[PDB]
Amino acid sequence: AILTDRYINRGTAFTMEERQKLHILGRLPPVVETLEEQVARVYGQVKKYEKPINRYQHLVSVHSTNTTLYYATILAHLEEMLPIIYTPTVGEACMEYSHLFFRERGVYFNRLYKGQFRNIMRDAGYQKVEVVVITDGSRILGLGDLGSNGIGISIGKCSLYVAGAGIDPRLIVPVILDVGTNNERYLQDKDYLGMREKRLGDEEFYELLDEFMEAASAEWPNAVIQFEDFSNNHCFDIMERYQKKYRCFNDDIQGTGAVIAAGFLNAIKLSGVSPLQQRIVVFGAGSAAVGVANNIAALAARMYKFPVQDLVKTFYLVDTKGLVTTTRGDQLAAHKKLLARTDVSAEDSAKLRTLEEIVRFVKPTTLLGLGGVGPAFTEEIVKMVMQNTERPIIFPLSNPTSKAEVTPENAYKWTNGAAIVASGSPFPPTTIGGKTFKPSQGNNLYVFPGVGLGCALAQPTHIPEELLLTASESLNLLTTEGDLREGRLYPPLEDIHNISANVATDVILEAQRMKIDNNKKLPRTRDELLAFVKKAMWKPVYSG
Amino acid sequence: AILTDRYINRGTAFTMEERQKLHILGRLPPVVETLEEQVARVYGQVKKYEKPINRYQHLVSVHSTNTTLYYATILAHLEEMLPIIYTPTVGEACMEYSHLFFRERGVYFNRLYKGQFRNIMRDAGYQKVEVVVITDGSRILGLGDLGSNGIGISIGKCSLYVAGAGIDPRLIVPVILDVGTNNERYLQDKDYLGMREKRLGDEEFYELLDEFMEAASAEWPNAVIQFEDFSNNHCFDIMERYQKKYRCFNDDIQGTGAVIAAGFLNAIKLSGVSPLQQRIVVFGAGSAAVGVANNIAALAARMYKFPVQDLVKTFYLVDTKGLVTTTRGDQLAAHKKLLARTDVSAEDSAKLRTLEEIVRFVKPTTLLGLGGVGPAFTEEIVKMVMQNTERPIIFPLSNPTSKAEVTPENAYKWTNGAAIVASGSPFPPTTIGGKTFKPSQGNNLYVFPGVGLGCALAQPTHIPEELLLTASESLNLLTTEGDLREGRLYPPLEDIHNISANVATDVILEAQRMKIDNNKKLPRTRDELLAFVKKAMWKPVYSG
């Protein structure tokens, strides 16, 4: 009974005396382990499996049986587990092994339940829910429509709030809004269990998502609503529609830009080449890429009080046509106009089409890789940036590893160790003349859990851009003089509870400053607040 | 809540109306399936996995989530699932993936709990337990001592009673008696959770197993105690110690011989060469091999009332020295003396050492392979048996497939389709001149579940050899004139519920005849009893 409840089950960590008192002697093998010992054992069971998917499968069974031991194992091996319990293994689990999510707590909405969303939420009988992750399985990167099987993404993202910021696992809810799927295999699959129809048009999409947002605000009024893995046709428009009326954010848009900005500003500090001296090529010009550039500018403006106009003029935006300029003769998308050069002639614009010739002309000190078109940061291009700065900042952020603008290894090799690198993926260290270099990974885990924990405590009426900017600055500042001396751009991933506690404290203080905080119990000074936030976090240890 | 209880959970088989009434709308994807549809889906999820162990792993997750759907899938695909859910996959799961059994109901005994066995049983809080499978992980075949990890064998054997004879899954208990392990890897393994010591001596072994047998008879008085996968130093002695005082049997010894005897007698019928005309080489002379020969003799004596002495003289026992004879000049083990030739000279015995020369001299009509020494039934040997009968009976029963005396394919090929074959493993059909041949598999599943179900209903004071002989004859008789016309030696495996119902009926009637039956509610005429037994069986269908 104790054993069959994954929240209180301790398995072999029940002492002999506990086993007699609880009447479970002879329900376990006789060895008694500490949690630490159970973690080392589970870690061995995981590494016995070869393929990421089989490792995920084993971990799902641990989560089903002993939740405390699951989260304890993730926290002890976080850098190594991350690619198994989320991107990119979780997407493969959704696409071909969706049965791995059947047993998980989860809430399914579709048009058949129109008008009943609030009843379905009430019926789930959750207490004071703090975090709700919602997807429609459409995919931010637009690859592999998962439809209903998108529930696996919400389940995996919810587990990262629990591991990263000690959101209590009983107080988090994964949600799929099934509005159909354009996945042709799934539409013909006899074993697809979701709505077997093409994705709904915008009017019906927004009718169901409006009902979702209103139901959640009434039935789960304490919750942060986080949008995950929505396609580009909707994700930006969703934030515009809801950002002021509901407590909501989108991690792919707002999280990514907070994390990259914090790392980029620490790269600037190590470079010696100060922010107004940086010449930054933004390779890629989607809404997301422009969003990150704007987040870098907003952060440098907050931290340093340079005029934001002067920071915007450090950016050279490159789209598929070439350098984005006002003299190019094309009609620019709204999002490209802000970062468009005003200082480049029509004649020069005509000769600024390939990344090689753009780099030669611009003489950048930074390359930001947000391009999603493979390895465009060639050896020749990296050698040219070496002419312009002693410390080239090179950020190949396009995912996955095959779409990356350059390998950290090549970046370090070509610069003889001078490159300051951040990556969107983990990479092993590179050694050059006995000296070791490792890229700093801008993982989204640095920001969303702390935002969730801060918004859970502070209960703000909404999440304005001030709170994401505060979280970005908080993260930047947690990189210690020592971390910086070793070339690290972020605090260490394995210190995520402390990082989340700090990010959360800083978010609450910003909400208090703006007077949007609904929880009057919280300390309002940083030292006392930080202590309070750390005590509020759920810890994966045997409690009782 | 309904969903988290594996006994009542129906998953997607809950109708839309049921989902509203039970307040679980939005806890499932929206498709509604019948059980049949769920089975086809689970069957596809299983075949997506390549290796037997990964298939077992998926099935363990089904068993954990929806028990009705698990048993429904096994029953629909029984011949194909059998090698995944028991021998030989289950042993590999015990040896290297013992975590697959952690979540299962199971009872662990060891010397540390001496004097508390009855308290541990009471504390498990089972109702009217019907079947208890116990092992010590020593292994009947003496390969791969599993120690504590032997619990996986008891768990898999218990699932075969539920699938085979509709023992209610709540009324069956898997047990490991951990008396240590001689597995050197395990003794040094930091993740072994069992008693980390060499196997106890006989005196302490029997102290703990006596306490087990007495505790079970008091706390689980309705149960059949089945011994599984005990080593040869103990398994025979255990039956001698307990057979009269407790309701117990050993499937490896008693089950195997019941199944092989039933098949062998049907092989005799197809051969035309009647039982007193058979000349049978018993290749292998362990206690087990001799037990099977004695079970064949006892069955032919029951069915046909030939003097058993005349049946015993149809057997030519071959041990590692050669033909077992009284003139050989060695001191015979007790178990070999019964089947020893009295009709062969010292001089002939000296020239009867190789199987080839023994076959040439004996001119057998049957070869029984119980030898465990690879493929000794050579083409030359099979050609010689063709000189002695138009229908050679060839039974390569040694496990696994590599230790087998001959492949059914070779047997059929070498005899041009004349061979009557039973196997200890499933084999695909062989086609010769457009005519198809398939060996009859003597699976233990034909007998133990029906014995368990019969002993569960009849509640006999004990299980004397009469009840195993009745079960053997029952099985033999269920092979229909039609089955026999197609060369089948057993009723079809997929008809296991009917086979178990019949075997059980016949066992009860024998217990009633002997007046050892404690349940006075049962019909005492076969037609009415059979109907009653079928109604008592738990069925893997959604009930409520």
Ligand SMILES: O=C(Nc1cccc(S(=O)(=O)Nc2ccc(OC(F)(F)F)cc2)c1)c1cc(F)cc(F)c1
């Ligand atoms: O908790 C139980 N058993 C247990 C036996 C050994 C060890 C442990 S443990 O908690 O100490 N370790 C552990 C756990 C589960 C894991 O995942 C996996 F392997 F089961 F998939 C891995 C390790 C736990 C248990 C739970 C029940 F609901 C019923 C029951 F009868 C037993």
Ligand SMILES: O=C(Nc1cccc(S(=O)(=O)Nc2ccc(OC(F)(F)F)cc2)c1)c1cc(F)cc(F)c1
């Ligand atoms: O039963 C639940 N979900 C379910 C979702 C789709 C289908 C089904 S099903 O029962 O129709 N099929 C099915 C099942 C489990 C299987 O095994 C495996 F994949 F989970 F390992 C395979 C198939 C079942 C469920 C159980 C809970 F305890 C909590 C919860 F929130 C949901």
